[PDB]
Amino acid sequence: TNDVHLSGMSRISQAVLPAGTGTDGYVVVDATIVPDLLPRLGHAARIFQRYAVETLEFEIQPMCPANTGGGYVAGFLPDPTDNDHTFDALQATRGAVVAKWWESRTVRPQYTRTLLWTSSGKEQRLTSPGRLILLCVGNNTDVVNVSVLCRWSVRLSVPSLETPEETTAPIMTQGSLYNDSLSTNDFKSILLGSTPLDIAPDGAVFQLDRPLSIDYSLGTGDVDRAVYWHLKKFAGNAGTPAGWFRWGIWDNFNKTFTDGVAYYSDEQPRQILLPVGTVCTRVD
Amino acid sequence: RSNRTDAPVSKASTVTGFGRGTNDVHLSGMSRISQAVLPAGTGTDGYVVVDATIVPDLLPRLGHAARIFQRYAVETLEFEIQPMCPANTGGGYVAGFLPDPTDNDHTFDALQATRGAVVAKWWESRTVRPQYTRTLLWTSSGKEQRLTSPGRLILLCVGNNTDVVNVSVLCRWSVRLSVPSLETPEETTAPIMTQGSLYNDSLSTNDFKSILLGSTPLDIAPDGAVFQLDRPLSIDYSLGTGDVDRAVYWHLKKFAGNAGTPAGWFRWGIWDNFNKTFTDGVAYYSDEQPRQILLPVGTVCTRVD
Amino acid sequence: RSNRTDAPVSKASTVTGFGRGTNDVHLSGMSRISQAVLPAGTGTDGYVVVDATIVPDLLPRLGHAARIFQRYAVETLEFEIQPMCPANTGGGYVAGFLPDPTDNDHTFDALQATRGAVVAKWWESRTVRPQYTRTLLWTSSGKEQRLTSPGRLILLCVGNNTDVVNVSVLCRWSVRLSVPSLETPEETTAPIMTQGSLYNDSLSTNDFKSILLGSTPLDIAPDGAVFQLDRPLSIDYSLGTGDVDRAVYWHLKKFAGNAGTPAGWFRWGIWDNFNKTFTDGVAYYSDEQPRQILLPVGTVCTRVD
Amino acid sequence: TNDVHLSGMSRISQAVLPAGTGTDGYVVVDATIVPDLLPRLGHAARIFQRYAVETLEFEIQPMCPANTGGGYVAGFLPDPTDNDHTFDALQATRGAVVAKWWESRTVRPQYTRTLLWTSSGKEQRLTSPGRLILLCVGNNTDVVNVSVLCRWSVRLSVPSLETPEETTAPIMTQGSLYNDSLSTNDFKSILLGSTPLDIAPDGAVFQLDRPLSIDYSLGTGDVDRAVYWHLKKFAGNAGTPAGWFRWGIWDNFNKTFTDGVAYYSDEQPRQILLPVGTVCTRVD
Amino acid sequence: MCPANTGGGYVAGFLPDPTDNDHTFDALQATRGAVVAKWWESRTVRPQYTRTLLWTSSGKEQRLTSPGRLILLCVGNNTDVVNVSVLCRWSVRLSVPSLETPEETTAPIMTQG
Amino acid sequence: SSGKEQRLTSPGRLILLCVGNNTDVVNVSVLCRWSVRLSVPSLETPEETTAPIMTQG
Amino acid sequence: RSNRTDAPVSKASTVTGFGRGTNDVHL
Ligand SMILES: [Ca+2]
Ligand SMILES: [Ca+2]
Ligand SMILES: [Ca+2]
Ligand SMILES: [Ca+2]
Ligand SMILES: [Ca+2]
Ligand SMILES: [Ca+2]
């Protein structure tokens, strides 16, 4: 037949968290479970179209000293469209655990056995069984390094080859970007408020469904609203891990980025340039 | 007694009863989907009386209980249309349940074709026992309605109603919720689309009528129900010396409707979640702009609040 | 076939499936009643960490399901206090569940007396299995809390906490709702009382701090949560030539709290239900008024919205 | 039961390839298999809601003269939203065949036997089983006439009745239109770079979900964007068989086309009006 | 060998391919039997290894003279100095008697730089 | 994965000789129908699967 | 599952298979 059964253990994500930045409600890991996350499955979902998760079992492995104060609540929201980052959402879902930082727990979640499309699509519920969310319960005393290991057993089918761009997971911004909030040539990703975007590697150029509408100067007062789409991550400094996002153009074939005009800084009435739900996808 | 346990650096967390909520709740009941009052002579053939998508938000008790679950599966759906008019009332109604939530068509043939549809005089009640899928649909809203709705009900006037007719489309629902979770009470509603089109020159200085948008729920919305535009609304105005900035608003809400137009009037503005407040922008001022369409047909309107 | 039925003047209504909703729903689950962060050296003996009345509004899933019923009866209540601090933390906590919702007392003796109370070091968890009545309590709010609440939980610092302590008071609840009905989502909350007193000369020109009212829920309220005063608030101002009118406001809400006072500041105003809007009155202006008390101790504050 | 097993042959599409236009990776045929390309299934899917594909066997009939040595590769992508038009993606898919223009081959792909819907929706993944793609390997010495036969055995269900427009299929742009390279009153489909848009019949109008900002002059070096949501298609010429698209207000209520307003293309900053991934839907 | 206050983690694996010279977390974790653990916790790697009669003496290809290689990697950032020992339990079954020279019995090494 | 000898990494090599000169440019495409049987799960780097070349002159 | 083990100052060394080589070899 063509139901290749591939199963293995792999790490979806790893996060380093400094001391004193673990206020309750902070999102350490917010990872949508698509095959692109898992390495071995990532190299095996590009040669198949449809997969069915038959066994999923996350295990959180933090590596911090025993004499540390702080907890981590971990859960698996079965709805990928759900974007709740509160303790209530996790405590509601089955399989959630809470434990001290030096502890390693196992999350036995509630997923769906239905066939799912490896390739990304408009309506996410056909492409992911859910999202894993790990929150701090209290302020951490020291730096904590956490690795969310994942044990999976999928059943791929429908042979086909996919570009690496297609298999990337799209993440919607959690915040609203306002016109007065912009800087001269970029903006911090804290305004977006999405942890996957915050921890995105530097240079990961994204494309935004919502048209970023920066006004460009007409010379004397007159305002014309330019529309720019492509955004590039710019490395987060020590003070601000969020990095920055310079607007512009990312050529598909040429793989080259462009920097747009400086934000039109004047008495413009406040507008929503990018509301919550602004999908960003790695074109790189 | 036991006193031989040494004191370690830290003790294992003992939060055992966690993530063990009940999964299955076989909720049931009956409720009124819609109620309409057809004036005499206005029930011309083809007029749509009730056009209601059956999502777990129309049903009130289910609406307040689908927010504590994620996936429901309809197990018994049986609509019961009840008119209230004397036997002297002349005219007929056809009732059906399209199993496709995206099938937005209003004709006698489309309704009659579907299994379980009924045709009856206005002075006679009926029961629509329709065909509905048992698959685990999703409670929360999504891009596609077909995964979040068993179907929609349509009621049409067959003849010409002689007198005013009061019709109530009751529904009997027996759902089986599952997959425990805590959905947010907003973003649990149903997306709505603009059947009509909104023009730049169809805008007033500050407001704009909902009947232009062509969607009945937009025409009847309580004050304070702030809607969300997926597509940007680029209002025109004079920022300075005729500075026509395409001010982008995504947030539309129904201020106190104008008495002249019962369908009422939206404003464009900022709906801040951190403040949960609606702040209005610069009033529309068409200075020098060729005619254009701002909100095209199909612009999805979901109510942020 | 049957065709022998004559046509009467009107036919009997055939709405049979009416008023037949399910009555019993054995809802269950676990949730977090409260979570507190005690700073070092501020956990002096007698300080109240958690003081929470257990109404079906603290429990979220029950809160969204007690609005579709009227009378619930608690069948299993077992609070599970969980601290999170290393073994080097010095100090102790006492936890209890007063079965009398009106018993507003915070002492070690009162807590320890009640059955099921526990005393333990801050680095050790406990389980409070309390005594609770099985009588059919009422979901909706009323004049007396004793018919709408099994009791209240109190947590107290026994010693002096050496370091900051993060404590979470979890609760396991297994209620049995009954008497189907559709309670309004507002007026389902719990009434709150002003432990402190609000003076005429303790009022600013426009605002007044919540910490003066002496009630913690009043001190921490989201912006837009409009409260109701059972007792009138007679603000003073100069209507004309020093016209000191005792302007009566019953509606108090928390505008954006002042950064200086985290407890924040209410305004007096009109909360119109027909518009669902807060309109502010004339700013307070103490022109010539001897000192007085406007909102005395025990003024019930229920949130209209 | 209500199942109706219809089965019959039909010609998916007819394509004309001008002499010498067979550039590298040129898409001769890009046809989504919706129940309209098949005429009998087109008339028989208007009376049902759910259809499941039980058999699908394509066949190429290149009527190109045997003198031309240009090559063709044929494949069936099982993902309707898949916008990959590369040789590797085709050849990986089951049943893909490569030959020359004087040779005719068949395609027997691996479809998905699930209950698709017969009416258009937000995502195509529940409405179509896939899409036939036929690339031209090398340039053609002679004009290539291509006819692709289909052998389908669907299994309809859920009786109903629908409208003709409800069975239509959306289109996606494979290229990024640029402001600096734009005709004043129109533009050809070469900028869009989508084969269905290349062969788009004259009279069809496509709605851009992205803001179609046409930047008309306010005067004195000041310009203003004008947002539109329609694209009327006009026939082009022999030199450029791509055609033309003009913006404006295709007011379907009046069925009148406001022509493309003047585009003041003098100093517009380099932007992409429609970045890669922009979609177009024939309003009809 | 470090106290419980040591912060950091290690991943251990046994690549069955002696020529696979790659050092990443994913490559190690993929192989069967790999472990991930904090620095203050021991582990046992029970790996997959071929039973074929490998050759003792060195040759052109290592794949006929080695069951595989072991890799140990630092997952986090070690807070203090950590002393790690990679013990091994082996039960071989020698055969084909002969007298190999003691030199040319060692293992070839390659210049990465 | 690549090694010192190709005899444990590949099953063989396709060779296609041209018997005589071509009057026209010859475009050749060689299709393969393979049914492999993988085992021993792991993960590798792209370069490790490359193949060496030998000079015939 | 077992999660009731507290975290001590240090854990006992678990090097069990030590000093257990074969003694007799009839070469
Ligand atoms: Ca795909
Ligand atoms: Ca949801
Ligand atoms: Ca009541
Ligand atoms: Ca349909
Ligand atoms: Ca040898
Ligand atoms: Ca290898």
Author numbering:
A (entry chain B), D (entry chain A): 52 to 335
B (entry chain C), C (entry chain C): 31 to 335
E (entry chain C): 114 to 226
F (entry chain A): 170 to 226
G (entry chain C): 31 to 57
Q: What does the published report state?
A:
Nervous necrosis virus (NNV), a simple nonenveloped virus in the genus of betanodavirus, infects fish and damages aquaculture worldwide. The structure of GNNV VLP unveils GNNV capsid is a T = 3 icosahedral particle with a diameter of ∼35 nm and delineates the CP as consisting of three domains: an N-terminal arm, a shell domain (S-domain), and a protrusion domain (P-domain). NNV uses protrusions to bind to common receptors of sialic acids on the host cell surface to initiate its entry via the endocytic pathway.
By using three-dimensional (3D) reconstruction with icosahedral symmetry, we determined cryo-EM structures of GNNV VLPs at pH 8.0, 6.5, and 5.0, as well as virions at pH 6.5 and 5.0, with overall resolutions in the range of 2.82–4.36 Å. These results indicate that lowering the pH prompted GNNV particles to undergo gross structural alteration, with VLP and virion structures at the same pH being virtually indistinguishable, affirming the use of VLPs as surrogates of virions for vaccine development. Cryo-EM images revealed a spikier appearance of the GNNV VLPs at pH 8.0 and 6.5 than at pH 5.0. This reduced size is due to an ≈5 Å displacement of the protrusions toward the capsid shell, with radial density and cross-sectional analyses showing that the shell size remained virtually unchanged. Closer examination of the protrusions revealed that not only were they positioned closer to the shell in the acidic pH but they also became more compact and were rotated clockwise by ∼20°. Structural comparison shows that the crystal structure of GNNV22 resembles the cryo-EM structure at pH 5.0, suggesting that the crystal structure probably best represents an intermediate structure that a GNNV particle adopts in the late stages of virus entry, but less likely to be the form of GNNV interacting with host cell receptors as has been implicated.
